[PDB]
Structure formats: C-alpha cells, structure tokens
Symmetry: C4
Subunit: 450 residues, 4 copies
C-alpha cells in the first residue's frame, strides 16, 4: 500500500504532521525562554512533546510509503521507496529531528527544553503543507495572507522569546531596557512576561519603537539588529501583499491595457463615435460576462490530447446533429471539432447578408439568430442554439445552381457565440478521409437537387 | 419592465443602495460603541435607519427586476428573474440583512443599535457599486485611490470604535491606556470621545504608536493584534498604490523596454549614429503622438465582426474613392479593407523610387506625399490624404508595357501614415470574386492603353 | 517662426517656465503662512513675482508659437496656432494664472500673498517639463528619483506651511500642540519657524509621529488627516520606487526566467551535463555581452521602412562584397539584406561539415571561422569578418557537379555571429527580379565551370 | 597570460579586490568621524590601509591583464589590453583612488584618515563582484537579500558617522540632541560612541524616530533630511524585496493565470465536470513535476546550433534505434530530431485507436504504453521508453495493403511523454535527402511485404 503524493490522503497527512511541526516551532523556544511556562505545565509539555515525536515517527514511515513517479507510473515497491527516502536529505533531517535529546533532561534538568530544538528540522513538512494548500484551495490569496500572518506571528513570538532571554541573561530589571523584575507581582506573572515580551517584539519588528531605549551596548546592538530585522520583515510583508495584489488584478490590468490600446487606436484613426461606443460596450460585455480570455490562446496551454478531449466534449454533439456530418466516421468528426472557430456577435450584428460570400458554416452555441428579410426587421425564422446554417456553402458540389453566396440575411438577436467551420478547414480535414469527402459531397448534391 | 444590469439605471441604483450600506457600515458600530452618539441623536438615527431599511427593500425588489443574460438575450420573465434571485446566496444575505432586529429595541433598550449589524450583510451592493465605478469612470486610478482611502477610513473608524468599547469594558480612566474618564468636561464630550478614539486608531493602524502604552494584559494583547492589523493595512495600502503605479506606467515601461532593446541592437550592430538618431527620433514621435501601439496587434483583440466594422468605418470611403475599385461589389471592398496594412513614414522617407518593384498600392491617410524628380528636391505633385498611387501595379494586366516597376519617386513630406494593399493581398481577396477580378483587370487594361 | 515641440528649444523653454512655476508653488504658500517671510523680503518677493509673471506672459506667447502636427507636418500658421491655443483649456488656465490679483495688495495689504495662488495654475508647464525630461535624459531613473524627492519635499513644505497656519489660527503657544509662542527669542525667529514647521511636517507625513500630541479637537482631526495623507505619501513613494526597481531589473528577470525554463527543460529531459554547461555558458555570454535580445523580435518593433534602413546600414556593404551579388541591382540587394538571418556560434561550433546539406549562404560579421580538415584541428583558411562562404550552394545552377553538400568543415574559432541567406530566401527575393535570377545563375555556372 | 573575465579566476579576484573596497567604504569614514577609533588602533589601520593599497595596485595590474572579447575571440595582446584599460574611465578612477593622500598624514596629522576617501573610488570592483555573484550563485535571492542588507548597514553606518561628526562639530553634550559629553565614563567609551551613533542612525533611517528631538536649526534641517533619506531607503528596501518576491513567484503567477483562464473557458463552455477535473489534475501534475514550461517555447530562446545540439543529445539515440532510420545518414537524422514534437499523455489516454488515421510516428520517452484490445483492458504488449510505433504509417510506400489507419489500440499506462514524427515532417526533412527517401520507402516496402 502506497500513498499518492498528489491525493487527498497525502494532503491530510501533511496537515497532521504540520500540527506538531508548528507546535515545536512555536513552543520549544517559548518554554526555553520563559522558564515558568516550561516548569508550570511540564506534564502537558511531556504529553505534547511525545505525541509530536510519535507523529514524527509516523511521518518518517509515511515518507517510506510515499510513491514517487517513475516512467509516468507511481513507484510502489517498498525497496525503491525506502531507497529514495534514505538517499534523500529529508531522511537525514528527519533522523536528526528524531535524535533523542530528551535524554539530556536527566543531565541538564527539566528547565532545558532547548534540547528539543532539533524537532524544528521537520520544517519541510510544514512548508510542504503550505505549498500544497496554496495550490489546492479555492482561496489562494486568503490562505496566502493567513500564511504570511502565521509567519509574522511566529517571527514576532521568536523575537519576544529572544528579548526575554536577553533580559534574563542581563538580569531582569537591572536596567530600564530589559524586561523588569520578575519578583514584582505584576511583571512576575507568566501571562505578563509573555504578553509584554510579545508587545516589545511587535513594537520592534514593526518599526514602531515605543520601547524603553537601550541602556547597555549589547542592548544597543540587539535593538539595532532587531530594528533592521523588523524593517526587512515589514518590507517582506509589503512585498508579498503587493505581489498578491498585482496578481489579483493582473487580469483586469491586461484587459484594461487592451481596452486603452484600442481606445488609442480608435481616437487616433478617427473611428466614428458610434463604433467607438460599440467597441466600449463590447469590452464591457466581455468583462461583465467573464469572456475576456481568447478561446484559442487559452486552449493553446492544453496538450493536444486534452485540448481535443475538451473540444469533443464541447462540440461533438452539435457537430453530429448537422445533417451532412450525420453519418461520417468519428475520426473525421474529431478532426472537424478541432477546427471550429468561435465567432461571437453583438445584438443586431449580421452574420450573413444575401449576397455575401458563403465560405463558412456556422453552428449556434448559446445564441439566437434571426433569418430576416432585406428590410432587416421581418424575422422569417429564429435559429436557436444547436442549430446551424451554411453547411452546403462549405461543400464542393459539382453542378451547384446557387453557390458561393448567402441566400439569407442571418442576424444576431444578441450575443450569439457562433462556431464556424470554413470550407478550407473542411477540405484540410477531409484530405485524410477521401470516402468521407465523396460521401459528403454526394449528400450535399442530394440536398441541392431536392 | 426589467433593468439592464449593464445600463445607467442599474449603476444609479447601485449608488442609491450603496448610500445606506455605507451609512450602516459606518454608523451602526459608531452608535453601538459611542453611547452618547446613539442616545443623543436617536431621532435622526431612527429616521435614517428606517430610510435605509426601505432602500434595502427596494434593493431586493430591484434585484427581482434585474435581468440576467441567457442565450445572449436579457431574461425579462418575472418568474425566471425571481427564481434566479431566490436561488442565489444574495437573496439569503438580503433577507438576513432585513430581518427585523429593531424589535430588540423594546427588550434591550435604545442603547443597543448593535442589533442593526445585520444590515452590514448588504456589503455586496457597495462592493458591486465600487467594482462598476472602477470599470466605468474616466479616472480609474483617482477612484481607486478614493476607494482605498474610503476602506482605510472605515477600518480606522471601526478600530476607533473598538478601542472605545474596550476602554468602556475595562473602565474609562481605570488605567492610563484606556480612554480617560468620561466624567471629565473635556474627555466626556462626544466630539472628543470620537476624535481621540479616531486619533488612537490612526496612530495604531498606521504603526506610528504614539499612544499611552498598555497597562493590562488584554491591553497588551489588543495592542499587539492592532499593530499587526495596522502593519497588514499599511502593506495593503502600499501594495494597492504600487500595483496602481505599475499599471499606470506599464505602457511607458514596455515602450522604453522596446526602445532600450533597439538601442542595444543598434549599438551592438554598430548602426551608424545617423540612423541611430533617426530611430530615437522615430520613437520619440511615436510616444509624443500616442501611436506606440501596433495597429495589427491592437485590432487582434477585437472580434472578427467588430474588427471588420472598425476597418470599414476607417478605410471604406478612401478605398471606394480609388478608380479601379469604384464600381466593385461591397463584399470585395470589405475583404480588401480588411487587408490594408498601415505603413508610417518619416519626413523625407521615400515610399517609392523610380525603378523600385511596384507590388503594392498605397492610400494616403493623414499625410502628404510629394512626387519628386531624380534629384529629389523638385516636387511635381503633392499627394494629400485620401489620395493614392500604385493601383495599376497590383493588377495582373495582360500585355502591360511598363509594369512591376515604379515610374515615380514618391517621398514623404512628413509622417505620412500610408495604408498599403499588396498584389498578393488583392489576389487572395479576388479568389472568391472572379467577375470582380476580370472587371478589375479589364479596367486596368483600359487605364494602361489610354 | 514656430517652435518644434519636440526640439531642444521647446525643452529649454519648458525648463525656463518651470522655474517660476516651481517658485510660485513653493514660495506663495510659504509667504502666505510665514508672515515674516513675506514682510521681511518683500522687495525680493516683488522682483521675483513680477519676473515670474513676465515669464508666464512669455509662456503664453510661446504657446501661441508652438506648432502642432497636422497631416504629419508642423502647423506654422499664426491663425491656426492661436486658434488651437485659445480653444484649449490650457489657455483658460494661463489666463486665470495671469489674472492680476496683486491689485488686492492695495486692499488686503502686503501680508496677503495668497492672492498669487492663481499662479499655481501653470502647473501644466512644470509637469510637462518633467514628463519631457523623463523621456529625454540618459538617466531616467535618477531623474525619476529626483522628481519624486521634489514632489515629496514640496508636499512636506506645503504641510509645514499648513501646520504653521493652523498654529497661527489657533494661537501660537495656546496649547502644547501648536507651534510655540513666536514672542520667544528662539521660536520667534523665522528660520526656526520654518525649520520646526518642516520638521513637524516631516515627522507627520513620514508617519514617525514624534510630535507633541493634539490638545484640541481640530488638532486631533488635522493630525488624523495628516497621518493618513502621510501614509498615502509613503505608500506612493514605495510604489514609485518599487515600480522603478521592477522596470530596472525586468530585463534581467525575463532573461533569468528564460534561463530557468531552459534549465528546467534540460534537467527534466536529462540533457547531458556537458551540454547543460554549454547552455549555461552561452547564456552567461549573452548577458555579459548585452546580446540577450533577439534581433528579429527587436526589429519587429521598427516600421518596415526604418527596419529596412537599419538592415541596409548594417548589411548592404558586406552583401555587395559577395561576388555573385557584385553587379545586381539595388532593389534586389535590399530585398536580400532584409532576409539575412543572424546565426551566432560558440567557440568550436561547426557551422558546416563536409557532407552537410548546403542550402544556406553565410556572411561573417564580427567573427573568425576556420576552414578545417576532417580531423578538425588543422586550419586551412581563417575566414574573418566580411568574408563569406556557401554562395554557390544557394544557386540553382543547371548541371552542377558537386551540389547540395558542403565540401569544407567550417568551424567557429569563437563567437562568430554569422548572417545567413538561405536558398528559399534567395528564391523568394528573386521572384520579382527574373533577369537578376538568370544573371546570378549564369554567374554561378561560370564560377563552377572554372 | 590573460584572465578570462568570465572565468573563475576573475571572479575570485573580484572577491579579493572587493575586500579592501568594502574595508575602505566602511572604515575610512568610521575612523574619520570616531577619532578614538582612528588613534587607538592606528597600527592596525596602517597595516590594513597599505594592504588595501597593495591590493588596489594588483587590481590595476589585473585590469591590464583582463582580456576583452574582440571578433568573438579573447584579446590577449598586452598593448591592446593596456590601451583599452588606460582609455577607460575606470583607469582614471583607479589612479585617483591610488593617489597618495597618506602624505597629508605628515601635514594634517594622524587624526585625518579622510585623506583616504579617494580609495572609495574603487567602488566599481565591489559593484562588479556583486553583479557577478548575482548571475553566478545558486541562490540569487538569498544573495540579493544579503547584498541589500549590506548596502543598508553601510548606509546606516555612514549616517551614524555623520551624526557623530555633526555632534562633534556642534559640541558633545552642548544640547540634548547631539551625542552626549564624551568626557562621561559611559558615553566617552568608543564602543558606546559607535553603538549609540549606529542606534541613532537606525532609528532615523528606518523612520522609527525615538531619538531626542533637535534643538538647533541645523539639527532640525539635518533630521528632516535624514528622515527623508530614511524614507527613501525604506522605500528602496521594500521595492527591492517586492521586486524579488514578484520574480520569485512570477512563474507560479503565470501558471495560475493559465489555469484560471482555462477554468473560465471550461465553466463558460460548460465543459463536463469530469473533463474539468481531468484538466485540473493535468495542471496539478504539470506543476508538481516541474513541466509547466512548453518545450517548444523554451527551446526557442536557444540559438539554432545550440537547440540542435540539445535536440541531438536528447533524441538522436532513440531515433537511431528505429529500424527504418537505422542506416540513414547523420544529417537526415539531425533534421528529423529537430522535428520531433513532444506529446504528453495522461494515464488511460489513448494515443491511437484501431481505425484512427495513422499520419504520425511515436517514440516513447519516459513512459509506458499498452497495446490493448478493443475492450481496452487486455494488454497485448507493454511498450516502454525507447520503444516506438507507427514508423510505417509515415512512409509513402507504393502498394500498401493496410495504410493510413492504426491497427492497434495504444493506451497510456500513465504520463507517457511521447515524441512524435509526423508524415509531413518526414517529407519536409527528406526533401533534401532523395536517396534517403527512396531507401526509407524501399525498407518500408520490405517491412510490409514481410
Ligand atoms: C552584531 C556584532 C556585535 C555583537 C556584540 C554583542 C555583545 C556586545 O555588544 O559587546 C559589547 C561591546 O560592544 C561591542 O563590542 C560592539 C560595538 C559595535 C557593534 C557593531 C554591530 C554592527 C551592527 C550591524 C548589524 C546589522 C545586521 C541586521 C540584519 C538584518 C559589550 O556589551 P555590554 O552591553 O554588556 O556592555 C555594557 C555597556
Ligand atoms: C488573542 C488571543 C488571546 C486573547 C486574550 C484576551 C483576554 C486576555 O488577554 O486575558 C488576559 C490574560 O492573558 C492571556 O491569557 C493571554 C496571554 C498571551 C496571549 C497571546 C496572544 C497571541 C497574539 C498573536 C495575534 C496576532 C494576530 C494578528 C493578525 C493580523 C487577562 O486580561 P487582563 O488584562 O484583564 O488582566 C490584567 C493584567
Ligand atoms: C474632517 C471633517 C471634520 C473637520 C472639523 C474641523 C473643525 C473641528 O474639528 O470642529 C471641532 C469639533 O469636532 C468635530 O466636529 C469633528 C469630530 C469628528 C470629525 C471626524 C473626522 C473624520 C476623519 C477622517 C478623514 C480621513 C481623510 C484622509 C485622506 C487621506 C471643534 O474644534 P476645536 O478644536 O476648536 O475645539 C476644541 C477642543
Ligand atoms: C538643506 C539646506 C539648508 C542647510 C542649512 C544647514 C546650516 C543651517 O541650518 O543654518 C541654520 C539657519 O537655518 C537655515 O538657514 C535653514 C532654514 C531652512 C532650511 C530648509 C531646508 C530644506 C529641507 C528639504 C531637504 C529635503 C532633501 C532630502 C532628500 C531625500 C543655522 O544653524 P544653527 O543650528 O547652528 O542655529 C542655531 C539654532
Ligand atoms: C506563537 C504564538 C501564536 C503562540 C503563543 C504561545 C505561548 C507562548 C503563549 C500564548 C498563550 C499563553 C498562555 C495564555 C494564558 C496563560 C494562563 C495564565 O494564567 C498563565 C500563563 C498562560 C498559560 C500563558 C503562557 C504563555 C502562552 C502559553
Ligand atoms: K513608524
Ligand atoms: K514612533
Ligand atoms: K514611530
């Protein structure tokens, strides 16, 4: 049995192992620096530390059971999985993180949880869980902000622990900069110790600076270094949030850039204000209805097989419904589906006029066309989605009375979204299906002579 | 009767409903936290709250009357509109926002406007009005900054209300951090209460921090959380403004990148300093005159129908004015208009020399050409906009005495902006208009034999 | 006589008129707010104000003499220039800025230079000078930073003047927030007044906040508004500098993105480490020698005429030096120059091997090729820049003994930078020059039969 | 002997010369401003200054020995190298930086190391070492952050030195703003002097501002200027880090933009949820396995020679293994290798079905294909990497019984990564190898008639 590293079980385990990694990264330093926190809840700390070590062991076992992909297949041989694990640097990191340093609790004493700092070497699982969540969630930016806030709170917490440890080393209350005397009823309280240390660290790492100024040299050095770290942290927060904001409205920026370029062209080329407003309305329609992306330039990112599967799933039924293509083989229908070109029209747009060159066949997807008269108001027929026209105009039919010309005025009652099959496209598709070509042309001949 | 959600009436209603949504989002919390604000203007608050509730009801009715687009047409059947509304989550939000919680004024008392916090669930209308304004205004960046400032002021106001409520819960003046005693003549005044709370909130959310430091633990916790919120707010302000600044000068950045790439090529390829200055002057002209965008790569964003309409509206009159195309059918003229290629020239640029291969026909749009002699200074004719030349050089005329060669020196008197119709383009256009082809070639023959 | 708005005279005048616009924008408010500054140097202020008004008059005259571009030519008819000026909004702004408000000095007194605030309506000239400098200087980013600093200093100066005016209106020293008593020997000094106001404004607009806190309500309101303005100013500074930094290393970012994509391909496709290092060295060479931009994709931004002029100026001499093209007409040589394809090679790269298909002709630009033996170390000939080979392999010569195959091993002694003329390119170029084709092929025949 | 300016020796020397440049840039100002630092370690300062001057001399000699690239070859003539050095501005800068100003130690005294400020003119070597490291290291962003921190620490150090010099000029302790009296036991200590000056400079340049406010005017001016410098420094830090963060996740941003565009297309085109999940899984696979970049659009950045070398090194062995191409000449095999098109498939994807048009030949690279029956579960053969099929379907073999159709159902057992050689590609490749074409077709005939 092997875990697919792209499945849900692997992600759930990433969460499960991120829990003790976060617990260690937040609490080992907190118990190392705030001695009362370590010595007053030592029973809970023992339980939680050894549950975390058990979960680390289970993480190593899982990492022996996680199949990597070789020759496009998931490797599921225990020998190969264990070999790829042990050969990896992650195995060394996991072994180091699992090295029993709690045995120093007998020599050093119960006031040294620093020994469990090796548990921090499982950071890879936590970072991997975050990376996987970011590529998995429906809210990538909400999670991105949550992850940024988590990093910032952990850095501020670590810096608070460092401030309290520096105050302890210098001596609580020995000068006005360090944390005050812990023999005071108010500032000797563990909640106060941690919360004032966190307040100090937030003041310093967010470059507010409303803390008692340093007294001693080491304090000046540490406060300088910590102000610089805080400047870098603030710059990183701003950089991350600004990169996220850029990516959030990069689509709108690109769309508005296209709009502005076309406005510039139109105003420069003295396009009439009527057509200028028609173009502005068209782009408003595109943005409002989430059709700003070009179908061709969007499907180009897919592979040929997956793009063909998409095209089939979208077009094959309506293309079979066409009468000429009703009884042609499947490979030809796929070759034709791959050659449909989307043509979107506005309300009142004429798809065809009587006398236009008919070189293309149109299929209606999500639209309503009106066969109208020369006056352009009288609707003979209303062609809805799934319907089509011009299927004879794309056939080379020997002896055609009326050809190469549209005999109807096809108008868009609004936002028709047609899909077009040109004559050259049909010929290129038929170049490998000659019996299909002759059968199609004979069927069109039967249609005409009717 | 149905409202077009892309028209002016819908946008005006978005403003009308954004007014009470903003009123609620700003004033419900302010009256909940500053008790004197609620109890001293309770008559105005009742009037405004119930006008807001009436506008919320009208918003729900409007949302039953707002037509969505189906099959490219605006749905205007009351059954379908009401069904799409009630099925939407927005309907649930509107019902929750309209749930009468003012009835708690009888149980809780007049000092609990918190009950109207459900009115904040109409935020969707306000956000939609902002989104629509951004895509509608001539000043997207001015409105973007105004909207950012509005969000920031509302967040600072909410945080001021939270600070005052925390001071109230802890006790006004009980320590030096909370808002002072409200029994003081100066700090017991409602204007002072709100303005000092707003000052505190601005100091905290903008990471200035010149406030009295926390005394109690909860105050330390809240000040840490509020400093972190303020860091995130500042990072968001910077990210939004920097994204806006990037988008504002992204066109200039792209243009300067092209300029620098061409400068790099020229300096590397040892292009003569004369031509190097000619290229620099050309790009200065492009930028100064708002022609930096490539016409082809700009019109590629349009649909084929709208691009054809643009091309017609720009070129069809000058193309009809041509003598050979004077009496050819309209479909051919559109097919030709779609094949004109813009060619811009600099002052003194030769479009043609005597002996150059004449394979292209030129139409002058916004320019002045000079038919000059071999010396290149004597102007025979001055060809202005609308004029053309080379229309015979694009015809395959059987038995042509002088062909394939230009017989004139056509020079640009400056920034001519020609539109070119090549011979291959005319042939590809005529491939579907054979009688047009034979008539064009016979007309060119009559022109030559003249 | 008419000024070219793209020439040096117009830019020099932009500087000349920006001087009084900057003087007004900085000094009118300073004299309005700091009364001793206005009343102690009133003689210098009169001289400077009226020199500024004279320069504003000369600016209006210049703007009547500035030719706009119509039909690609510079309009230089005084009637048309004056009409385009007076019809413009800039003319209204200039008239308003020149409205004599100094006449109020008789009614209001010498302590009211606020009357000259209309002179600030010439801001367009200053902004235009900055916009022109940015597109003109060799140091766009240095000037960009200087312009940002100028804007920031002017905003801080204006805010300092506003702080001093608010202190004056409330009363100097009436509370601890306003500017102190100006009857003090130290704080009553004009240098102190301005420099402390500027210090206050810098503390507030840069969100440092180390100022005496507000006492009164209006002071709280103003300090809140000024902190928010300062947050927006800081965000704008960061946005501008970050946009500038992005544009500064966008070329390196794009290049490194290409490098990383190719590294990803190579590592994935298991490209041998030898070729992997060859590719890395090639990209290091490209970046180190400023050849990262693709010649084709760089020249595509030029117009056809200017791209042809570049190609001629780069290639025409070496292409004439070729023996087959020695006596062919100029249009054909230009058509061929436009078809040379750059081919860059690395040291030791073989351009041709004995037996390779010879379909292309090579011209050496900035390189050294070695005709070597089959062993590949013995150099028969060393082909330098300007030299060429393969000119027969691109000719269709009837009855060729040895054709379609390279008879030499051409090796690159390092970074050869060849330009290639394929056979298909020569045929496409000759399709319009048939006598050139027959003469070229007969010349190649004479070469072969020799 | 000449140093390659792109080799390891040149980079090592860049480090060696950056050491004394950094030493000068950090210590000359520190000794100039902190007089006890200069006068208490004067022996170490003499040793280090003259070691730095020796290294500057060696840098000038190295710069005479650094070969530039001319005609693609490394210039290694001492005359030309020395000429290009002395003609350069860098030679003038090096001479100025080496001008003996230590001779002023006899006139000015040992308390004036300012004389060595000319040594700062070697900044070019330091900046060049940084630029070279950035384009050389495996950790460009880590080094980028380190270099930013180095610049910031040097600016803060310089500003600390400036603050101490201003305090000295005004007088230590003369007011509450300057550095206090240096006759105090605590603040007269050199460690305290420097560390408090550095603390002051960090407070000021990071816009924290928790320093004693200015007393005198010059102090107000300097503090304003230094706050503005610090605002610019913070904006530059944020801009650099945000540009780095943008470039770090620009690949993920582009990939997610493609994903979102395809999601938009699919949801709009009503693609079935099955295929929608198939596309999402495909993109997850692409990102997880570092194959997000399109092979064609990635290799387009390479030159033709290097792209051909890559293609050969990747494909030539498997292409030779093909039976029809087993004994064809090498130029044809390279022409064919350059025409392989990557086709990646998903588990269960059918590469071919019985009856599909066989126009393409497939080679398996990193995959496993299964020849299956019409039911699609029974595997006849399992085709692994290196294997191929369809090599007859790409040959025009006179008199072929079964052609143009696939006779097998080829299925992907998962992530097959095939490389395709179409029939048109083979024909275009054979157009220059006619004997290869006839031999290939006769070999295919022998295969068929077998
Ligand atoms: C850091 C290196 C120096 C650490 C010395 C700690 C012990 C100590 O600072 O030793 C001090 C002696 O002052 C020193 O040697 C150091 C003086 C100057 C140190 C300069 C530090 C450079 C800061 C730039 C760092 C920026 C990086 C930020 C990255 C984002 C004794 O300490 P004291 O407080 O107990 O004496 C009671 C008073
Ligand atoms: C927040 C969780 C704790 C809230 C406790 C409030 C009541 C209280 O703080 O309880 C306190 C007891 O201290 C505590 O338990 C909490 C001590 C430590 C809390 C650590 C807070 C983590 C902060 C990171 C948050 C960053 C997120 C920002 C996102 C942008 C009693 O309050 P007191 O002031 O009345 O005692 C008079 C003195
Ligand atoms: C601003 C609107 C209020 C101005 C009132 C000035 C005179 C005055 O503040 O009137 C005050 C009375 O307080 C008021 O009415 C106003 C109280 C609340 C005003 C709320 C201001 C909203 C701030 C958000 C603005 C953010 C925009 C920043 C964009 C970047 C009397 O003034 P006092 O100092 O002489 O009384 C001696 C004590
Ligand atoms: C700077 C120009 C003035 C320097 C005067 C120094 C000596 C002195 O400030 O002279 C002062 C006299 O005040 C002055 O003339 C200057 C008054 C106003 C100066 C305005 C400075 C403009 C600031 C904007 C700069 C922003 C650029 C930042 C770029 C990022 C005497 O000095 P004191 O302190 O010995 O008098 C004891 C009290
Ligand atoms: C990094 C952040 C998010 C995690 C902070 C964890 C630690 C350091 C903090 C947060 C919760 C805090 C606890 C909150 C409440 C109490 C109860 C109090 O009567 C004694 C201390 C004690 C138990 C605190 C000790 C410090 C503490 C455990
Ligand atoms: K600050
Ligand atoms: K502060
Ligand atoms: K501050």
């Amino acid at each position: 049995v092997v875990i697919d590293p792209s499945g849900n079980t692997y992600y759930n385990w990433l969460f499960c192992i991120t829990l003790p990694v976060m617990y260690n990264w937040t609490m080992v330093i907190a118990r190392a620096c705030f001695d009362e926190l370590q010595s007053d809840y030592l029973e809970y700390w023992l339980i939680l530390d050894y549950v975390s070590d058990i979960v680390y062991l289970i993480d190593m076992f899982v990492r022996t059971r996680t199949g990597y992909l070789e020759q496009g297949l998931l490797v599921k041989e225990e020998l190969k999985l264990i070999n790829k694990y042990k050969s990896n640097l992650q195995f060394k990191l996991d072994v180091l993180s699992l090295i029993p340093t709690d045995l120093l609790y007998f020599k050093l004493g119960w006031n040294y949880p620093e020994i469990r700092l090796n548990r921090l070497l499982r950071f890879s699982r936590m970072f991997e869980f975050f990376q996987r969540t970011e590529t998995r969630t429906n809210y990538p930016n909400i999670f991105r902000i949550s992850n940024l806030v988590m990093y910032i709170v952990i850095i501020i917490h670590w810096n608070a622990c460092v401030f309290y440890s520096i105050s302890k080393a210098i001596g609580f209350g020995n000068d006005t900069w360090v944390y005050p005397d812990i023999n005071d009823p108010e500032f000797g309280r563990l909640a106060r110790k941690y919360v004032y240390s966190l307040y100090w660290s937030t003041l310093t790492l967010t470059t507010i600076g409303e803390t008692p100024p340093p007294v001693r040299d080491s304090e000046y050095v540490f406060v300088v270094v910590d102000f610089l770290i805080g400047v870098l942290i603030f710059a990183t927060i701003v950089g991350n949030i600004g990169s996220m904001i850029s990516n959030m409205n990069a689509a709108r920026a690109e769309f508005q850039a296209r709009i502005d370029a076309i406005k510039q062209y139109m105003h420069f080329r003295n396009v009439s204000k009527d057509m200028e407003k028609r173009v502005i309305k068209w782009f408003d329609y595109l943005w409002t209805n989430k059709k700003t992306v070009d179908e061709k330039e969007v499907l180009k990112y897919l592979p040929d097989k997956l793009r063909a599967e998409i095209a089939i799933n979208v077009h094959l039924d309506t293309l079979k419904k066409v009468r000429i293509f009703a009884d042609c083989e499947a490979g030809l229908l796929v070759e034709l589906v791959l050659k449909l070109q989307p043509q979107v029209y506005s309300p009142g747009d004429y798809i065809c006029k009587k006398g236009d060159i008919g070189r293309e066949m149109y299929i209606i997807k999500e639209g309503k066309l009106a066969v109208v008269a020369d006056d352009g108001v009288t609707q003979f027929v209303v062609l809805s989605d799934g319907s089509y026209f011009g299927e004879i105009s794309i056939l080379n039919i020997k002896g055609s009375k009326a050809g190469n010309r549209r005999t109807a005025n096809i108008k868009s009652i609004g936002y028709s979204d047609l899909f077009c099959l040109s004559k050259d496209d049909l010929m290129e598709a038929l170049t490998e299906y000659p019996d299909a070509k002759t059968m199609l042309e004979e069927k069109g001949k039967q249609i005409l002579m009717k």
